[PDB]
């Protein structure tokens, strides 16, 4: 079809898991509002593929910064912004790779040596706060 690779591998799988788009905004919450965090509205079959990606050192690292690459950006979100979600509907490619990050952390998969507030912390601070404007869903 066309160029592709890791990035694609992620999209594919992920895309071959969830359903609609809003799902994401639903995950951030649904995810951190389930019980097993593995019954979410998504198959583990594919997710397992997007899960066995950060099972590598350099990976975990490259991922860490990767996650921050978004956080560092989430520390602005335009000027007249409000919801962080708006900062995804536009670019899915990234909003995807990221979504993967979150989920992982939401399921305690990704690794990152460093105590105190971290990604899962920030990502959660938003995934949650963002769920404060959604509709408690």
From Swiss-Prot:
SUPFAM superfamilies: Hypothetical protein MG354. This is Uncharacterized protein MG354. It holds the Pfam family DUF1951. It comes from the Bacteria.
């Amino acid at each position: 079809m066309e160029q592709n690779n890791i990035k694609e591998q992620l999209i594919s799988f992920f895309n071959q898991a969830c359903s609609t788009h809003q799902e994401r905004l639903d995950f951030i919450c649904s995810t951190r509002e389930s019980d097993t965090f593995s019954s979410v509205d998504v198959p583990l079959e594919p997710i397992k593929n997007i899960i066995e990606i950060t099972k590598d050192e350099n990976q975990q690292i490259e991922i860490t910064k990767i996650a921050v690459n978004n956080i560092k950006t989430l520390s602005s979100v335009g000027a007249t912004g409000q919801y962080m979600a708006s900062f995804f509907s536009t670019n899915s490619e990234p909003a995807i790779i990221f979504c993967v990050i979150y989920f992982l952390y939401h399921f305690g998969f990704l690794k990152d040596n460093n105590k105190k507030q971290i990604i899962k912390k920030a990502y959660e601070t938003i995934a949650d706060n963002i769920a404060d404007y959604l509709n408690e869903n």
